[model samples]
Target: AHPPVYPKELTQVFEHYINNNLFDIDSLVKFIEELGYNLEDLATLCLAHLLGYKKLEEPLKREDFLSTWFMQGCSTISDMQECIKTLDVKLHEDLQYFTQIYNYAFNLILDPNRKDIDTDEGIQYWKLFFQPEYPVRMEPDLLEAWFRFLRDEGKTTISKDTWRMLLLFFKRYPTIQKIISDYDETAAWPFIIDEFYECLQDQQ
Candidate 1:
């Protein structure tokens, strides 16, 4: 019968993690390490989103973390760790949720000053974000073909629009036949995607 109030116990824990007025990457990393999660793990990205980080690489703002955790009602550091342990299971079962982290990752590794991300970086994240055990995973051959296309073309960079649209393609055309049957040259799909479609046909 108690109202859902922010856990007072977390206040002290939060104070310990703050650096330069927010949970900077160093503090964030240490806290995550204590939870036994490597920064490369999918749970790390999920935690970033949960803590209200706009991008994975950014610091956790004090207000954002406080306001966010309050709703979840995790009263103690151990309670928070217990909550985190479930993220891997949740991520495995939820493709749509993983998609949110997928999008966050694109911006996480992207250079702030640059207009486009490197193809190498793009491929690396593709593998990380779409792990084999996760629900959102691509067909191995379908995914490999994409990596091959970009590499074969010696593509150096990928525009933000392309990165975003690529995710749509993965969700929309999970099977090779779907892409073959549904892909339209005149559609709004990016030129690289269009070309990659051509590569698929050529390979067959």
Candidate 2:
């Protein structure tokens, strides 16, 4: 079988960057910015596509990642918007199941030095990294809720190992809803998350 072909436009974009030595981190950021996409958003989705390397530093494999993205019919900003729209709807439909491991998955994309997720400083990092992606997935307050729940449970930090498991969780629920509705008792969520919901309720 022939390898799947990418869109001609996508091929040109990637080839232009790679051949011209513009595929490095700084240039790649500028290149994506010129295309009207945020670097962090591209990094999150690109890391999702790469799916294994946690410490994704310089010399990224742009051709491999972009080819896959192009195969998703996302060669342009408009295409990505439409694709994310469909994904957001699907994530919402599966929110109850998705929230079970949402925060954990997100921590994987965080900086290794930034594992202390329950502190205010840690939350700031999360806000910076997540807000852009959140507009299409969940609300900012919901992220705060997640952090609050963890802090209340006396959990102050996340570990690299746990963050690694988070990657597995994301494979199941790439994005989730901001506000949860009725939740299921038998879901695999930890007991603390149930308490988190209860906390939300007590305030209402």
Candidate 3:
């Protein structure tokens, strides 16, 4: 019997980075940035690969996933990106999964330990997740507006639920609509989301 064959790109990635085949969060983040990618994207993809399912959510400890990625030949940012790219192709090739994985993974940027994300973290999220060429880059004005509103409201630290909801909100309504749709008005949104809509209304 033959051993499973891994992609040469994975081997190349392993050799280029993580030569020691160990995981160090600080070192991994630095290397990811060096690979012309952002840490959050790598982290999200790493989590997605570890989870192995787009629809389900899973709780992951830091250490286990570190070892998992190492064993999977995805010890570096580039390696993970290649892995994700292949997964992307596979998902689309079936025409059944679509961008569900990508969408779910994109929101998994923050560490599970952190209950909320602050302004700097929010800024980094946009920079990491929505680099120039990405299909769904965040709008700068919307981010700026959000920051200003949060600051004025004396609530700079945004809850994780709100953070995820904000992304979903923006995805659904890229630009603020002139009329508040019935769905927006009737839905049981978080207070911050409701206020965010009000903030946008005032701005426009």
Q: Using Cα atoms with residue i matched to residue i, what is each candidate's TM-score against the true structure?
A: 0.81, 0.44, 0.55
Q: Model 2, residue 103: what's the lDDT? A: 44
Error of 2 at 31 (Å): 5.5
Q: What clash pairs does model 2 have?
A: none
lDDT of 3 by residue, 1-204 (tens): 675354444444444544354534544455456655555553445445554523222333334544556676775566666766665455435423433444454445445566565766665555544443444445667656766777788886767577556656656665545224422655877788788788777776
Off by over 4 Å in 3: 1-22, 30-113, 127-140, 178-183
TM-score of model number 3: 0.55
lDDT of each: 0.78, 0.50, 0.55
Candidate 2 wrong stretches, greater than 4 Å: 1-5, 16-24, 31-53, 56-59, 96-107, 110-122, 125-157, 160-204
lDDT winner, 1 or 3 = 1
Per-residue lDDT tens digits for candidate 2, residues 1-204, read 675566666666666666355456565555556545575542334333332333434455766557656667677656655655554444445544234324434444456567534345345445553454332234456656667766777766655454334333323333333123555436765454456556766655
Q: Order the candidate numbers by lDDT, best to worst.
A: 1, 3, 2
Which candidate number maximizes lDDT? 1
Model 2 residue 141 CA deviation (Å) reads 9.9
Clash tally for model 3:
0
Best TM-score among the predictions, by candidate number: 1
Q: Write the per-residue lDDT of candidate 1 for residues 1-204, one digit (tens) a residue.
A: 794345567777778777867788888888888777888777887787678676555777666777776777775777778777777678777777767777776677667688788998788777776667877657878888888888998988988888888888987888777788888989878888999888887876
